[PDB]
């Protein structure tokens, strides 16, 4: 019903450049934060002598890198735009990828929500002088405003739909998915692009620590430890594609979980310090979206925790979130993912949601670390929750795994939100052994190389992966990009075979050398060229002058290809971007 | 239900510092752009000479001007928080009087949902330095972001709900809008506060002519004009106190008008140049806020457009409401509040909207300024839209008065909204002639004596208003401030005697000055003094003490002295804020 299912999603966080490096780190404990000697810290002259200052930060590896030819950006442009619009931008494209959507595809509505900083874009460089109308002027107001982190989306991709941007402080992922599934249940859109990205200036540099503050004191982050003095502050970005369930199934996409879910509400005139959870209002959000979801406390068996790592604030927030759970919850997981990355401003909630969505996926509990003394204030035993000091099999006595995350802000900001497993995937019918086109594009020749090196990593990785799910993936779900490469083959060995060395070694690279392609074999649809039957699309021979005529530059009819079988979308390697550093040079 | 009545309302514009001021300046057809000489503009030392540079801009008096008492802020915050931060503030403060809902009494929960433009924070100051996490620290960012222009409503006010900000370049007030009636649609919130406000930095200043190019060559804004050449740039503020029709009609509100429906999009990929109608994308727009409404486009007589005042840029947008009203729509009254005021940025959308909901309210319908030759392009007479060129009485052969208001921005934001006239007054049971209390606040006794002088100026102005109507809303509609002035009256005649002068000639005056009140006489209930019997409650010896007490800085319980009768709140004049400017002086 009012479930919205994530088809997709993409991140970077401190130590990860992607999701699936994100939940390794996770899942092994490891921290992600980054310390320095003094001479690495190129700033804060002032301060870096000081006996407070920490040298430790959760850095964003290539916050400056950006590939503007790609989405058909000038260089020139792709110096003007602040860091969070490039690095959103870039999370955008590898969200549509990951949930196997090809824009230009897209037939539906489509609405972003993004959360940014403000106070990023303002330190990257001065802001648009409005003194006069030209088009160079709106070319650097789009560079520089949040109003077009989202707008850019749209346009950049090619989509048509809605974007809307809101600045929530340190809730900021939240408050998007919030709207997103608003915007979703109202039926205004078809999907929804929805996340934050933080990117902190200057980046390479540390902090001042204060007595009795949220930064931490040595740099480690020690959650629900008695010892824990804070922090620390970290960038990152995170994006999911939002889509209603029961379409979700019905177009046979890839889970990862499911929002049950959301709620929003500000502490207003019962405020307290930064960090500090009030236990009514709080509540009344972690309550307020369980109730909206209507899962009761009893079903859920995670709780991702705000967790400062404080033991003032962590008290506020385990009482706060016992309030909201009552007496018969029963027992539950809880953690937080600061301890891995620290606090990572708009993005947070966005970071502890993400490490939620991955458990439930694949029913893992990920340990929470650098926690060695419990907090004895807070009454764990005499809690619903337990702390998961080790990884662990999700394998609850409730029945159902459900989620709930929570992420606290300055200003009074709250939300929680709750998720739920997957649906379980159904019995499929066996594959049928028959030949299948395989394609990748990208804008160059050495980027289609490196799709043939991701692929083919991905496929030692995922063996259990089916092989019509890969082309139905491959061939609907990624954009056609002028330089081409393509295969037809019958097994997933083979499809290792022809990805191996330079390429060159398959059946349609020797027809493309050997002749241009006969368009007066193939018949005009108003989607492309196609075979003249069924049987021709069974036919390696036939397969091979389609495929060689697609990577020529003709446009190919890839959805009657695949018109006889009903294959699932799975999650494939991202794109390649060529990591070219862009920053503006006058300010 | 579904629809959303605006109970209150507050602006600022070019020309008005205040919503009567403005609405009376539409009504006269008069211009609210100021034209400079040289010396007067103190920027711009590059382009003051230059022959394109034109002395005009639409100037928000008093930008600078803050009342940090009222609110509880200090001089360094006041300082500290960025003009658009203090403006809407005080707006918001007179929002709620102009509904009158005291903040401290309110029992349900207040959204706070507004539109801000970041350019102009970036600006006025350096932003906040993260470095450290001290509460000076919290000070600086609690000034400067703009997600804390709705949160700090909600502090200062002492009100509990949500605050969410959105930046959508030149549509920002729909967009507010829009959010705010999701959340009371959806029943997070029980009323909400919306609006968007623009201070542009520098704030005397002109701007640069360019051929073809949306600013105007001679300063002047004429919509819908052969001549025209653009518009001029512009500052303001608007927002509007939103709550269900059927709960407002039940708590006796006063409405102005009802929001029917809104919808937004953006034109994504099918994107235009600035000020450019998409008119495919806009129509859908236009077509899904009058069917969220469950409006026929048949009985929208009234048509507020963008009208930038360029030919090219009106004749899109009228092309594309014409695709949403369809052929058999009929007849439409089409006006453009820019070419009285100029483009107002983040809140010209609203400047719109806020005339729409005065047409609405006063079933009046005000000219379109600086047109002398229509555009022959456009042909009006095969469209339903007459340019308003005169003032008129509005009588719809349709029998309902609705009106459409359009915002277009920049990055491909589109909005509009769907307003219906206000539901018809019930027929009233005749006042009881009987001694009541009426009450007035303010933070010294000098602003006190303005609130008087404003209050039996009101009296000249609203000859029609009931006294019991006027005590109603006065005792639960205001907030108990430390300087108190109270009397006891039993006319209209008899209040105007009182207040006049310096208001010690009342019997609650006299009462004072002789003797305290006797505390023993009351009976204390939960939400203050209360007395002792319903035959009390109409003794005037009774009420005086009462009053007198409540002067003497005890809390009394007005709830129950109105609890036999069922008045209506009204509009009464808003607070005396005493404005001093506020500017930092070290970036
Ligand atoms: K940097
Ligand atoms: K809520």
Same mark, same amino acid.
């Given at each position: 019903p009012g479930d919205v299912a994530i088809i997709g999603a993409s991140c970077r966080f401190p130590g990860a450049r992607n999701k699936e490096q994100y939940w390794d780190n996770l899942l092994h404990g490891r921290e992600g934060v980054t310390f320095y000697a003094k001479d690495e810290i190129e700033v804060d002259e002032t301060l870096i002598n000081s006996p407070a200052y920490v040298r430790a930060t959760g850095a964003l590896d290539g916050y400056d890198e950006f590939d503007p030819a790609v989405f058909g950006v000038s260089d020139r442009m792709a110096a003007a735009m602040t860091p969070e619009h490039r690095v959103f931008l870039e999370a955008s494209w590898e969200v549509m990828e990951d949930a196997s959507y090809d824009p230009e595809r897209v037939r539906g509505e489509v609405g972003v929500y993004a959360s940014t900083n403000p106070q990023s874009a303002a330190l990257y460089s001065s802001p648009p002088d409005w003194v006069s109308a030209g088009p160079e002027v709106m070319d650097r107001s789009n560079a520089w405003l949040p109003d077009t982190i989202t707008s850019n989306v749209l346009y950049y991709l090619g989509l048509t739909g809605e974007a809307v941007t809101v600045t929530a402080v340190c809730s900021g992922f939240h408050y998007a998915v919030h709207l997103a599934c608003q915007s979703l249940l109202l039926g205004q859109t078809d999907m929804a692009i929805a996340g934050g990205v933080m990117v902190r200036l200057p980046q390479r540099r540390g902090y001042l620590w204060e007595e009795?503050?949220?930064? $931490?004191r040595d740099g480690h982050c020690r959650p629900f430890d008695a010892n824990g003095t804070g922090s620390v502050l970290a960038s990152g970005v995170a994006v999911v594609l939002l889509k209603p369930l029961p379409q979700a199934v019905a177009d046979r996409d890839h889970i990862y979980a499911t929002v049950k879910g959301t709620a929003i509400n500000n502490n207003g005139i019962s405020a307290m310090a930064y960090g500090l959870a009030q236990p009514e209002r709080l509540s009344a959000c972690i309550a307020g979206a369980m109730q909206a979801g209507d899962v009761?406390? *009893?079903?859920? $068996?995670?709780y991702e925790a705000n967790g400062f790592g404080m033991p003032i604030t962590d008290s506020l927030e385990v009482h706060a979130a016992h309030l909201a759970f009552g007496k018969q919850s029963g027992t539950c997981s809880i953690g937080a993912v600061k301890g891995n990355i620290g606090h990572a401003g708009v993005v947070a909630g966005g970071s502890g949601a993400v490490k939620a969505a991955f458990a439930l996926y694949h029913r893992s509990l990920p340990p929470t670390i650098?926690?060695?003394?419990?907090? *004895? *204030?807070?009454?764990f035993p005499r809690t619903p929750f337990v702390p998961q000091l080790e990884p662990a099999a999700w394998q609850p006595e409730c029945g159902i795994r459900r989620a709930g995350i929570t992420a606290l802000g300055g200003g009074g900001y709250n939300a929680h939100l709750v998720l739920e497993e997957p649906p379980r995937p159904v019995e499929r019918e066996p594959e049928n052994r028959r030949p299948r086109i395989v394609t990748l594009s990208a804008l160059d020749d050495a980027a289609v190389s490196r799709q043939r090196a991701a692929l083919s990593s991905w496929l030692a990785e995922h063996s259990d992966a089916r092989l019509d799910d890969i082309a139905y993936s491959l061939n609907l779900g990624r954009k056609a990009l002028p330089s081409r490469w393509a295969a037809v083959i019958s097994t997933r060995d083979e499809l290792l075979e022809v990805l191996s060395g330079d390429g060159k070694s398959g059946r349609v690279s020797r027809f493309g050398q050997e002749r241009r392609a006969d368009l007066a074999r193939f018949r005009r649809t108003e989607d492309g060229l196609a075979l003249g039957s069924g049987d021709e699309m069974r036919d390696v021979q036939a397969l091979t002058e389609l495929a060689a005529a697609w990577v020529q530059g003709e446009r190919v009819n890839f959805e009657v290809l695949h018109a006889d079988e009903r294959s699932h979308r799975i999650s494939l390697p991202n794109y390649p971007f060529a990591r070219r550093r862009f920053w503006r040079t006058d300010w």
């Open positions: 009795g503050r949220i930064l $931490s009761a406390p *009893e079903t859920v $068996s995670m650098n926690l060695t003394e419990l907090n *004895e *204030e807070i009454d």
